[PDB]
């Protein structure tokens, strides 16, 4: 039937422009219905930005139109967002969307990331217990993965053999550059007689580092 | 624009019971009010459009009612695939407007957080860098309050927090909490000490390590 599909640059710089493309398939965007942006920020917070109707009109979000435009191709079967002044309070998910009877098709979305950060690879430290805080039975470890950009990064523990005990976090900024630590509680039985190590892949730079969490002196 | 406001932020029950989520607006938006469900990692979904409509697909658990003002969606019998995310928005006026978003979470016992706590390793201080880190694992409900001591005194500068959403075993929480100084400043004090406070416990609860200790 109906189907939105969004794509568009995943990282640019603040000040910069860029365009959204929302390309439908399954329904002629002149036929009928409004075509729709939608975006959400971090936190779930929905925000409109604006559409334009199969007969050709466009509206905006007030707060938003001496920024963005509105434009379509209706032989391809697309309309895009186009954003100027991009601010680094515009990095969010966007959604492209058909609406009327509320807002009944939508696509996957796209990430978009304002930032000013430079692909560089990440430093991953071993975190080995201080010695003397583990409660018998379960000894938990840990990995900490910071300073490296762009997202995502990959992190597993024993290539994939450890699967339960294991807690990874959401990346975090700290100056302009993602920190995220991840750790997994084993029992006191494994670990300081089995080795365990972390792996973590920072495709982007191309990097994959193991590290092996060791008793500390 | 006309504000809509979501009262129950975040609401949570048991499988098999009856919810009633609210969405107010501040002006008159009659019935034009439709509700867009996001399971995590998804775009949201059209659930009842024209305040009552039920959307097609959708199963009859789901009821919404009211008018001009004050909308409501009901949930007969609440089940799994039904945690999620619950967004109601108006489009009588233009600048076409959403609320603040209901979260629904499982409820389940509540369960003290295993802290743990981490020197920096040598191989990040060989290099200049102090981080301590500390983890707050599976624990329940959210609210919880981290704070770090260093030598007995708080610190809120070089605090990094991060929370991962309900899990979807246990259903509990976790976070980290963690530290960052410059090596100078940390061979400089010896006692750090991350205390948490939760619900579950009268005193707070507190993970520590002196650095003068191996």
């Known amino acids: 039937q109906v189907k939105l599909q969004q794509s568009g640059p995943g990282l640019v710089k603040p000040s910069q422009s860029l365009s959204l493309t929302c390309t439908v398939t399954?329904?002629?965007?002149?036929?009928?219905?409004?075509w729709n942006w939608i975006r959400q920020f971090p936190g779930n917070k929905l925000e409109w930005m604006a559409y334009?109707?199969?007969?050709?009109?466009?509206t905006y979000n007030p707060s938003l139109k001496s920024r963005i435009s509105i434009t379509r191709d209706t032989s391809k079967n697309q309309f895009f967002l186009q954003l100027n002044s991009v601010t680094t309070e515009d990095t969010a998910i966007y959604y492209c969307?058909?609406?009327?009877?509320?807002?009944?098709?939508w696509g996957a979305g796209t990430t978009l990331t304002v930032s000013a950060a430079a692909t560089t690879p990440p430093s991953v430290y071993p975190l080995a217990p201080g010695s003397a805080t583990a409660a018998a039975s379960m000894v938990t470890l840990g990995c900490l993965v910071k300073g490296y950009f762009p997202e995502p990064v990959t992190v597993t523990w024993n290539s994939g053999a450890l699967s339960s005990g294991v807690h990874t976090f959401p990346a975090v900024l700290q100056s302009d550059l993602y920190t995220l630590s991840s750790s997994v509680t084993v029992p006191s039985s494994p670990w300081p007689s089995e080795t365990v190590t972390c792996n973590v892949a920072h495709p982007a730079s191309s990097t994959k580092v193991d590290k092996k969490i060791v008793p500390r002196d | 624009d006309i504000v809509l406001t979501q009262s129950p932020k975040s609401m949570s029950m048991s499988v098999g019971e009856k919810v009633t989520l609210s969405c107010k607006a501040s002006?008159?938006?009659?019935?034009?009010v439709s509700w867009y469900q996001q399971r995590p990692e998804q775009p949201p979904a059209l659930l009842i459009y024209?305040?009552?409509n039920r959307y097609t697909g959708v199963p009859d658990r789901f009821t919404g009612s009211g008018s001009a003002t004050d909308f409501t969606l009901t949930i007969s019998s609440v089940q799994a695939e039904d945690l999620a995310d619950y967004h109601c928005?108006?489009?009588?006026?233009?600048?076409?407007?959403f609320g603040g978003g209901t979260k629904l979470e499982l409820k389940r016992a509540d369960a003290a957080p295993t802290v743990s706590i981490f020197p920096p390793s040598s191989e990040q201080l060989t290099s200049g860098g102090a981080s301590v880190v500390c983890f707050l694992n599976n624990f329940y409900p959210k609210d919880i309050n981290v704070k770090w001591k260093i030598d007995g005194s708080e610190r809120q500068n070089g605090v990094a927090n991060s929370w991962t959403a309900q899990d979807s075993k246990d259903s509990t929480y976790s976070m980290s909490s963690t530290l960052t100084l410059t090596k100078d400043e940390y061979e400089r004090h010896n006692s750090y000490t991350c205390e948490a406070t939760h619900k579950t416990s009268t005193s707070p609860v507190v993970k520590s390590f002196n650095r003068n200790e191996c």
């Open positions: 002006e008159n938006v009659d019935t034009y």
């Open positions: 024209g305040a009552s």
């Open positions: 399954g329904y002629s965007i002149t036929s009928d219905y409004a």
């Open positions: 928005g108006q489009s009588y006026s233009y600048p076409l407007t």
């Open positions: 334009i109707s199969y007969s050709g009109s466009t």
């Open positions: 969307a058909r609406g009327g009877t509320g807002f009944d098709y």
